Structure 1
Amino acid sequence: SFFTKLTADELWKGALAETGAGAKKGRKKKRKDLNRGQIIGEGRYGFLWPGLNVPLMKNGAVQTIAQRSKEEQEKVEADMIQQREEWDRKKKMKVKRERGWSGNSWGGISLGPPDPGPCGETYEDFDTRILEVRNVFTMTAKEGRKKSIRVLVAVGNGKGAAGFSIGKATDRMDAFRKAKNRAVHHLHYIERYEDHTIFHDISLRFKRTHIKMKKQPKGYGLRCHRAIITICRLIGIKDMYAKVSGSINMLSLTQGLFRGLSRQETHQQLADKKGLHVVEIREECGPLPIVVASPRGPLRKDPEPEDEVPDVKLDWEDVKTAQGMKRSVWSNLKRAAT
């Protein structure tokens, strides 16, 4: 019949069964458009209607009704089938994503720049990276076990300004959006020595996570925990060592890393505090003294105490490595460029 026909949208809604008893709580087919490759005025009879499917004027004259030959109609059908096959192949194939720390992990995966601000603010210079995606469940009487997604997101412009945030949502993409839009309002500014490394070694203990960061020369690379590698790439640090001990909780790790990096003391601040030239000694430069910092105010003529023995709390791992007693089969392993 004819009056029993329906629209494409209603038929697709009925066939796909997007809603129902099975889809209500989770107790494969996908929509395909049949109008993308169909042109008005094209039928199996292969008629040419002037002005609808063929140009209204040919050689400057009004065209008349024409019918394509059987071979021409076969050619047109072959072209339509070829176009449909090519579009189906293009839809089936995809531009493969760049995997993060592992193929099935969400960490390290870039999310693109954060959404632009309302008052003419754009964050196209910022890169967004995922650090943890956890499924968190709660016991509610109304719904039994409620499921949500908590996502830890780190953003950074590669020039010191970087931040992190936590996004809770029922949908993963919504959590990503929330976290990455909230992070840019919580941007620490990390001071980098020579725009490539930290100013000094940082030993910190955030909750039950110890982070030991060692300042390293140019070209040493990022020999750090993969999360710390990602965060340092976001900040703009290119050479640093970092060892994580105790609890390796990602949230505590990120919070402690940001706390330590923000609390680090620059050379200029040290020079102003102690009123003395901060002079750099480099082995590659020999005995040449490089004055990297000078006090802003009057210089201090006190020759400072020549401390015979520094009362500094050393770390046993560093001393063991320096003396060679450490023989771990995992240290100094050759790894990909970081």
Structure 2
Amino acid sequence: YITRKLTMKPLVMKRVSNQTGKGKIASFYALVVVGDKNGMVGLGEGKSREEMSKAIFKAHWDAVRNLKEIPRYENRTIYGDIDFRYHGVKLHLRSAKPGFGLRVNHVIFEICECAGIKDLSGKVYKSRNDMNIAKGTIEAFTKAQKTLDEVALGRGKKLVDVRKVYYS
């Protein structure tokens, strides 16, 4: 299941130094996202001294471990707007009409492509770090999103009642 269905895309690939007394030691950080495009996604991180390949390797395993189900509306978009603050990134994301593109920041684009979020429009305010953007994106996707079924049951209402009325 895991290899054939999950798709891996590197999001961050960089060199971070830890200057020790003898000299500058340089290691490789990699941040990746694995998603089946069908409502399951996860993020992974890896750190390797000798070659980035090992960093991406451990990142792939870590992403596989943290693979989690993601709420989705019609299997194409978020249930409602998500306004989320994560360690200095402000993500404002909006659900969209069918056929709407992924008109978002690129990091969010790969995350949505991996997780099967077809439709979204969003803006990133305050800091624009890709690392924090990705972490906050997944967190706001899973914590900050509530399914209409769950909302209705928590309110003890039928889906017909909670569903919005059509106006024109």
Give the structure-1-normalised TM-score: 0.47
What CA deviation, in whole Å up to 9, does each residue of 1:182-228 have, x standing for no partner?
11100121111000000010000101100001011101111000110
> Alpha carbon RMSD of aligned pairs, Å?
1.4
What is the match of residue 114 of structure 1?
none
How far apart in 1 are the matches of 2:38 and 2:2? Answer: 16
Shift of 1:282: 4.5
- Radius of gyration: which is bigger? 1
What is the match of residue 141 of structure 1?
21
What is the one-letter code of the residue matched to 1:266? T
What is the match of residue 275 of structure 1?
156
Structure 1: state its 5+ residue gaps: 1-120, 287-338
What is the match of residue 245 of structure 1?
125
What CA deviation, in whole Å up to 9, does each residue of 1:82-103 have, x standing for no partner?
xxxxxxxxxxxxxxxxxxxxxx
Structure 2: state its 5+ residue gaps: none
Whether the aligned pair in 2 keeps the contact of 1:188 and 1:258 (CA below 8 Å) is no
Counterpart of 1:221 (choices 95, 101, 109) is: 101
Shift of 1:269: 0.6
Matches within 5 A, 1:170-319: 170=49, 171-263=51-143, 264-276=145-157, 277-282=161-166
Whether the aligned pair in 2 keeps the contact of 1:215 and 1:239 (CA below 8 Å) is yes
Taking every aligned residue pair, what percent have the same amino acid on both sides? Answer: 31
Matches within 5 A, 1:1-338: 122-142=2-22, 144-170=23-49, 171-263=51-143, 264-276=145-157, 277-282=161-166
How far apart in 1 are the matches of 2:107 and 2:2? Answer: 26
Q: How many residues align?
A: 163
Shift of 1:173: 1.1
What is the one-letter code of the residue matched to 1:279? R
How far apart in 1 are the matches of 2:85 and 2:12? Answer: 21
Aligned-partner SS, 1:124? helix
What is the one-letter code of the residue matched to 2:32? V
Give the structure-2-normalised TM-score: 0.92
What is the one-letter code of the residue matched to 2:116? G
1:219–1:122 Cα change, 3 Å? closer
Moved over 4 A (4+): none
Whether the aligned pair in 2 keeps the contact of 1:214 and 1:242 (CA below 8 Å) is yes
Shift of 1:123: 2.9
Select the structure that is richer in helix. Answer: 2
